[PDB]
Amino acid sequence: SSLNEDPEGSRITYVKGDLFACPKTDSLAHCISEDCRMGAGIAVLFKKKFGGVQELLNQQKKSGEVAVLKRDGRYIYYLITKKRASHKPTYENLQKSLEAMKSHCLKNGVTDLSMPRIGCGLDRLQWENVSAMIEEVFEATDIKITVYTL
Ligand SMILES: Nc1ncnc2c1ncn2[C@@H]1O[C@H](COP(=O)(O)OP(=O)(O)OC[C@H]2O[C@@H](O)[C@H](O)[C@@H]2O)[C@@H](O)[C@H]1O
């Protein structure tokens, strides 16, 4: 028991639990397409709670970009993958969007980011490749990543 929240010296922390139960200082990230369809997978809850869908289209983000919304004091990262859900995202393009997250996080002082198992749903990706890539991109950052796995 320690009052300071220490990470265990890791990039991706695997925890089973609901992702929406995360703190206000801890930001959410997930992947979606350019068409932005939340009506599939975990994306549904983010649309409902954070009201991201229109705002994302309002900002106009396309493949290789990230759309972020400040909501409840935390950030919400929408990694824009490819045009639609029927399209398989590439890891390189996903990497592009991952880079944008780290750049934003460090800039604002966001040292806490949680995400679900991205690259494991309609995205059709292999987590072994996805996770390792995230683990490389964020390898040298003060960003505490925790994946909520259901
Ligand atoms: N509220 C939740 N909290 C924690 N975990 C959850 C929650 N809801 C679902 N999960 C679990 O974590 C994972 C949710 O992430 P995914 O949607 O499966 O993976 P992701 O990369 O985010 O999917 C995005 C892809 O599908 C479309 O939304 C979009 O087109 C994009 O390409 C799933 O395995 C699910 O079981």
Side-chain angles (χ1 to χ4, degrees):
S1 303
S2 301
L3 56 68
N4 182 33
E5 189 176 303
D6 301 272
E8 301 181 282
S10 185
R11 300 296 63 188
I12 293 183
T13 304
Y14 296 101
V15 64
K16 180 170 59 185
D18 188 89
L19 182 64
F20 294 86
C22 298
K24 65 180 63 59
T25 309
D26 187 84
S27 301
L28 300 300
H30 59 112
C31 306
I32 57 175
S33 49
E34 306 182 278
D35 180 58
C36 301
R37 296 183 58 192
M38 296 72 175
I42 182 181
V44 182
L45 303 74
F46 295 98
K47 194 292 287 296
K48 187 59 179 178
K49 304 183 66 180
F50 301 110
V53 62
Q54 182 61 89
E55 303 303 275
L56 305 182
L57 300 178
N58 186 273
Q59 302 186 91
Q60 289 289 330
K61 292 308 192 182
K62 298 187 64 178
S63 49
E65 299 187 87
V66 63
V68 188
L69 306 178
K70 178 180 294 184
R71 296 296 178 144
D72 185 66
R74 73 192 72 194
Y75 289 110
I76 309 299
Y77 299 91
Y78 295 89
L79 300 176
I80 306 300
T81 53
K82 293 181 60 179
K83 186 173 297 182
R84 308 197 69 217
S86 181
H87 303 213
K88 183 182 64 182
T90 49
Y91 297 87
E92 175 186 77
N93 177 88
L94 181 60
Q95 181 183 30
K96 301 299 182 180
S97 57
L98 300 178
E99 299 181 283
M101 296 190 300
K102 63 171 305 188
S103 304
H104 176 266
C105 299
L106 301 180
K107 183 64 176 300
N108 291 211
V110 180
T111 51
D112 294 87
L113 198 174
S114 54
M115 62 185 63
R117 294 187 61 180
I118 59 178
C120 302
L122 294 69
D123 52 69
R124 307 178 193 186
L125 301 179
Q126 287 65 31
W127 178 259
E128 181 178 88
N129 309 271
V130 181
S131 177
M133 181 172 59
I134 302 176
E135 299 178 269
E136 300 182 290
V137 177
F138 295 85
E139 180 177 79
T141 60
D142 295 285
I143 303 174
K144 186 291 288 63
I145 294 180
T146 302
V147 303
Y148 286 71
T149 307
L150 292 184

